[PDB]
Amino acid sequence: GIGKFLHXAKKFAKAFVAEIMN
Amino acid sequence: GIGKFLHXAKKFAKAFVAEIMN
Amino acid sequence: GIGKFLHXAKKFAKAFVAEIMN
Amino acid sequence: GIGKFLHXAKKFAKAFVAEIMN
A1 to chain C: closest CA residue: C14
Name which of C9, C12, A2, C13 is nearest D7 in CA terms. C12
CB within 8 A of D10, min separation 6: which ones?
A: none
B contacts of A14 (beta carbons < 8 Å):
8
Structural resolution in Å: 2.2
Contact call for C12 and D11, based on CB within 8 A: yes
Distance of CA C7 to the CA centre of its chain: 7
What is the DSSP code (8-state) at residue D21?
T
* Contact call for residues B16 and A2 (beta carbons, < 8 A): no
D15 vs C5: CA distance, rounded Å? 6
Amino acid at the residue C4: K
Expt. technique: X-ray
CB within 8 A of A12, min separation 6: which ones?
A: B8, B9, B11, B12
CB within 8 A of C10, min separation 6: which ones?
A: A2
Name which of B7, B12, A21, C5 is nearest D16 in CA terms. C5
What is the DSSP code (8-state) at residue B21?
T
